[PDB]
Amino acid sequence: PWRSPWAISVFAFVTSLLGIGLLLAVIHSSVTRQIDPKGCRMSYMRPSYAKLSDFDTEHTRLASKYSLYLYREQGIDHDVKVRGVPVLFIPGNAGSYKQVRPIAAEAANYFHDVLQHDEAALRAGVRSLDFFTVDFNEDITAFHGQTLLDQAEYLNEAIRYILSLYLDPRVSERDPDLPDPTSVIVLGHAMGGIVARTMLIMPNYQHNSINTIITMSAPHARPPVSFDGQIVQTYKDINNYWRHAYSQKWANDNPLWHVTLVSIAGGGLDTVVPSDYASIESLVPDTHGFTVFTSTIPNVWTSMDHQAILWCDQFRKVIIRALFDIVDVHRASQTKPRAQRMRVFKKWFLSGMETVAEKIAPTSDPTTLLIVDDKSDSITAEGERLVLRELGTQGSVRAHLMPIPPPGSPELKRFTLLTDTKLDKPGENGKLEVMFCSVIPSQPNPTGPAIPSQLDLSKGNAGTTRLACTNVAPDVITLPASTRFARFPFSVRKEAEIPPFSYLEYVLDDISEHQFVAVIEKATIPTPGFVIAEFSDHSNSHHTRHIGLRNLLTFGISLRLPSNRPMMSEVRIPSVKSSLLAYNLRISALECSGRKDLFAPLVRQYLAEPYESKYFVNARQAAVSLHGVAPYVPPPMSREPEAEGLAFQLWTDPTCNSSIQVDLTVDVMGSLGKLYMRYRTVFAAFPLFIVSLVLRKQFQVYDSTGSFITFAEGLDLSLRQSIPVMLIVLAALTLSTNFHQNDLLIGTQDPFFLFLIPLIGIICVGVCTVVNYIALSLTRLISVVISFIGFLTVRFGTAVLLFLVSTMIPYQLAYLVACLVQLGTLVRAQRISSELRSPANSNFHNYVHSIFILMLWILPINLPTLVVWMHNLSVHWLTPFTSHHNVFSIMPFILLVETHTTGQMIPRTCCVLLRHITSILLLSLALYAAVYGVSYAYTLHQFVNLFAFWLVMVHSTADDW
């Protein structure tokens, strides 16, 4: 019986409704649930660009297509001359060379305002930053690999030109004693970070010409999409190059020995590039680089868009300060040595509470000698917190000396100090100064001249004990100000910014050589300010909750920290690692009896795996979203059991004498919406798993009964047996020194996330049903247009295609034209089937429609190459095409579409062997799309091309062509 193409089973309709429903729930809860606060303040400047038009086609063939600019900030840069350190900014996929405005303007203003007057800094080798930016015509690099290689080659030539600029007296004004620059600092945004890394493997790379790469939101670990095979191959090349180079034992064999790469990720607000891909932990050892999120950068403490990471005011200030602390024009490479650069980058980008953090004060030179009476009024008893609720109560400079406990005890102990008042630098007068003091023996034992050592005498008597003291300002940890009037670690308005807190954390072994911690209260009149300092035991401050993921998701975890707890407490849940699960954290009200608390509770939600810490000021209710073990990224390196999972660091006022409760439960809808970033690219390949299984059932029934069923009927028959079985096979496949372990299927071999395979399968079933109905609607709409033209008329009245592809037409244009001709054939077939309603006309219509659906699900992969080609034609760039690849990638589709235009139905199918070949081919296509589809989506075109060729063979000689 004739069954309409529009009819659908209740089973297949309900399943498609759930698939579309689960798609809307994932999409909706990815834009509304667990969204980080936006805290970027807009930056304003006066942009200007000088085109370096002497860098032309004589230097590189790409100079007819690309351009190089020198950023000039009006009012500060009054001429086009280079006078400092060259910096190169590389924009991303369809980015602009004008996106260098904020970072280049901050650098121009900061040197004008501050540094050019700083004579010591100029004596140390600091100069202007010359910001060069490159115009790529908004070329789409992520979707084309030859574009990426062209950009890298152009930029190597551009670096040669830039370094030649500093040799010309008519273009460069510099001190004559300075060395000639031999390196450029590269700042790359998005795919620009990849061009920056690609630049070091290209054959025209000049050695030692790059040593500093900073990338903002660049997908280092993994290509964003795999629609082009050249992108995937270039990623393999650069990732292999880093891994092989840094795996060398001898530095002379390491080409990247002097290169530092710092990867900054926007975080959860970045919806263009997943922040999971920014992790370079599998590429760069910690001695040469790290991955940092903008939420952990001090004085930034916010997540950012892909585009906001460039123009954020707080972030641009920090990056410019870091760039100005590494430059050294006394060295031909215009930067400090690699270790010093790493130390500076850690200081400016990291929280300072990391394991890789370096403590300077414990083992540095003393900067003051403190003379204090022997009455020991200043010297307090061990085991007492020092709490200063106001500064300047007495009216004179005071010293509070806290004796450091002896190291005899076996358990680990820490000294922690928190204050809201800025700590004085050495040789400075302010409200407060903290310093590590060591007793100077009364015996005149010779030592350093102590000429830098200033002297503070607070003894005023004959006692006069002498202390040599080191200021601890080098190692101050900046914490967001947590007061009762604060809601976010940041402030979008500069006027409303609260000056941040100051925090010191030391292990007892680091400072055991000293005898005291001196908190020098220099204020005389009573001024607002608090200081809390104490020594605490690791047992009392650090709590670990060993709870499985199943129990955590079922019940949650709840803690009760006691009242007699330190200022800083840590709660670690080692079983919270996944980036796909989001939680809700609740901190109970601090019932401070009588007195108000010195400060509101501060929570630091942090991970050690990348450097991602998130701060919650005045914490009661926090959304816990972490970038941990992501699906398709290389596996995490080895770490100690004390640094696995998620940890919460808590600061509360310890004088309140009130216990605090910490609850952590799972956010189901937020966890569901976490899947959009991780699995959006599954939907260029995985719907082909469903389509191939439906076309397999359609051909099975045809070869057995001679009736070629509709796509909806094939879907109904496949959902009953074929699709569920092959999802079980995918699950079984997942359960069965390599950095590509995580490229296949769902990205993870973890058993907990096996439900993702049914989830993706059902969403793809819904998407395939919707696309089927869209194609049916489009066919009917074009048929209505044709019939309307016919009625308006009535009432008011070959074999050349091979030559085209070999010469100039990329096979993607031919594929689009083939899809259009197939749509025309589909319209003709539907019209004929409606007119005659024969069982033979229904077969041809259904067959042509299914082949059209198969062709249509490959078009997403081919479309990006058309926009690149059209763009290149607009720019007048011509790219030759290898005829062997073009012809063989399009001829089976051309022949199939021609055969369909002849109106010939596929011959019904040693004969059983030909019957089984179609089944095996479609099964292999389904399995291949499911398994290798995310990482190797460019191979699907070739595999579907092979299937189109077999169908041409069954058509020809399996019948009369």
Binding site: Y44, M45, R46, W311
Partner: peptide, 4 residues
């Protein structure tokens, strides 16, 4: 002038 000034732009953003």
């Amino acid at each position: 002038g000034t732009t953003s």
